[PDB]
């Protein structure tokens, strides 16, 4: 029968992060297709997603 279980998923390696004047730079090195998503923590979130 069908039963609800727990699936173990891996966490992608931490990217090379460098800070700048009101901007963030990330050097992404994926081993497999990894999803990147970002949003603002204010009134306008403006969600953007990319594989």
């Amino acid at each position: 029968p069908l039963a609800n279980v727990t699936c173990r998923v891996p966490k992608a390696r931490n990217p090379t992060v460098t800070y700048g004047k009101n901007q963030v730079i990330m050097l992404l090195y994926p081993d497999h297709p990894t999803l990147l998503s970002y949003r603002n923590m204010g009134e306008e979130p403006n969600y953007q997603e990319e594989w």
């Binding site: 390696r13 931490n14 090379t16 090195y29």
Partner: protein, 50 residues
């Protein structure tokens, strides 16, 4: 540097341009050369080249 072939002295150069495609720091892997600004010896970071 003079080279004598059939009793004739040959002098080649000097080159008009001192230009080279390589920078002051290069990286070589098998048959490929990359103009890289690699980290110095004893200053490498985790997950990065070096």
């Amino acid at each position: 540097h003079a080279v004598t072939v059939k009793d004739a002295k040959f002098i080649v150069g000097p080159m008009s341009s001192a230009w080279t495609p390589f920078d002051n720091k290069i990286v070589v892997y098998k048959g490929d050369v990359y103009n890289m600004d690699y980290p110095p010896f004893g200053a490498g970071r985790p997950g990065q080249f070096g």
